[PDB]
């Protein structure tokens, strides 16, 4: 095992002031770590914990390469679409996982941070797009959607709509419409020299 000893951030990802909106999600690279996954085992009553290819009880017993953790926020009972191999409104235009995955899908139902009580218009998501996305692709352009054969000069009119739309989270809608901070974490097994390893002598 390598002789590195410094801890690396699993506290600047799960404990963050503001997650990125789903249409433009934020990706972080984790490397050169003595990585222990026991810190996130409790972390409030997880609404979802599925790792798709490795038992979560044995994660600090393996050495990975180029771990990538990326996070965003979801409307509510919609994190069902983050599983691989299924389609939907948000798995087609916002974020799509491949058919083969090797990562966990932690999500933990924050409502005391992402719900103002007033008007919350800083969490957007794409609604209109010509074609479906591609696995692990980010679309960031804000251009006027054109659902027709007539060119658009840059203003909203007939079949000349706008793609982005706000969520407007409220502390009243219950559980179906209630913000969900989501973090997915993909890692590739040993093919190259290892950089991230668990704690072992």
């Amino acid at each position: 095992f390598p002789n590195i000893t410094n801890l690396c951030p699993f506290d600047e990802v799960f404990n963050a002031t503001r997650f990125a909106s789903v249409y433009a999600w934020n990706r972080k690279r984790i490397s050169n770590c003595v990585a222990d996954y026991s810190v996130l085992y409790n972390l409030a009553p997880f609404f979802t914990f599925k790792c798709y290819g490795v038992s979560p009880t044995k994660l600090n017993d393996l050495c990975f390469t180029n771990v990538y953790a990326d996070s965003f926020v979801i409307r509510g009972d919609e994190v069902r679409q983050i599983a691989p191999g299924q389609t939907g409104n948000i798995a087609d235009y916002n974020y799509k996982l491949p058919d083969d995955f090797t990562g966990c899908v932690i999500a933990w139902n924050s409502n005391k941070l992402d719900s103002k009580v007033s008007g919350n218009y800083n969490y957007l998501y794409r609604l209109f797009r010509k074609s479906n996305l591609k696995p692990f692709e980010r679309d960031i352009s804000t251009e006027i959607y054109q659902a027709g054969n007539k060119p658009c000069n840059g203003v909203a009119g007939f079949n000349c709509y706008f793609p982005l739309r706000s969520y407007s989270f409220r502390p009243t809608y219950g559980v179906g419409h209630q913000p969900y901070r989501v973090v997915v974490l993909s890692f590739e097994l040993l093919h190259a020299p290892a950089t991230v390893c668990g704690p072992k002598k």
Partner: antibody
Framework: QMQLVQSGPEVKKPGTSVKVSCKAS????????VQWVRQARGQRLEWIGW????????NYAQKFQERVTITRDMSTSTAYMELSSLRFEDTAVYYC???????????????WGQGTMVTVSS | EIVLTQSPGTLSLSPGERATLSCRASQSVSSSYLAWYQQKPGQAPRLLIY???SRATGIPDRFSGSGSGTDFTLTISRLEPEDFAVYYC?????????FGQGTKVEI
């Protein structure tokens, strides 16, 4: 594409409110936009307002600004228009129009409903 | 508000002749947003020409349509005995979207 199915005739009294439903089937309703039109007996057509199905944004005329409300239901695939504070001049036939929009919209309202008659009597 | 004046008020052509209609506009409107509808007595209107130049699907080549800017015209080559209805013109470029007066074609 099939002409949008519209509700049946209504007879109301002045003061109350009425609701008209427009059900769409046979084409991709998730991109199209629905406009509402009123016509009296043997008179010119009048414009009420239009709504985007996906976004839900509405637009009305300066006369119907504070009397009509247009909403839609995606799961049922319907468009509803509620008109309140009926008067003697509100008795007419209402039409529902949308473009036949599959993979690409038709650039014109070529699908029209059969029309619903509302009579404000006493 | 955009105001559309449709002329002439009434047409009295025998069948088999040439028919012309005009939909003059108060202000300039994009040629990409203008439609001509036909209205039979006691029936819903139907779309004939959209975009001021392109016919709708399943429409005979008799109806042509032309014009741009502030002058739009509709032309019918031969009057079938079923082409006697009320013709409206509607612009949907900028809100509000306003119809026309209507032109009646008789025998």
């Amino acid at each position: 594409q099939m002409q949008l199915v519209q509700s049946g005739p209504e007879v109301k009294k002045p003061g109350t409110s009425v609701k008209v439903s427009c059900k769409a089937s046979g084409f991709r309703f998730s991109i199209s936009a629905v406009q509402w039109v009123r016509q009296a007996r043997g008179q010119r057509l009048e414009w009420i307002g239009w709504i985007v199905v996906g976004s839900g944004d509405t637009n009305y005329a300066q006369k119907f600004q504070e009397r009509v409300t247009i909403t839609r239901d995606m799961s049922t695939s319907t468009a509803y228009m509620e008109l309140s504070s009926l008067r003697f001049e509100d008795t007419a036939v209402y039409y529902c129009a949308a473009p036949y929009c599959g993979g690409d919209c038709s650039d014109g309202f070529d699908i029209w409903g059969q029309g619903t008659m509302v009579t404000v009597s006493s | 508000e955009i105001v559309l004046t449709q002329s002439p008020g009434t047409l009295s052509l025998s069948p088999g002749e040439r028919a012309t209609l005009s939909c003059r506009a108060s202000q300039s409107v994009s040629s990409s947003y203008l439609a001509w509808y036909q209205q039979k007595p006691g029936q819903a209107p139907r779309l004939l020409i959209y975009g001021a130049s392109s016919r709708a699907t399943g429409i005979p080549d008799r109806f042509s349509g032309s014009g741009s800017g502030t002058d739009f015209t509709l032309t019918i080559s031969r009057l079938e005995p079923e082409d006697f209805a009320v013709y409206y013109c509607q612009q949907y470029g900028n809100s509000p979207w306003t119809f026309g007066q209507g032109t009646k074609v008789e025998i």
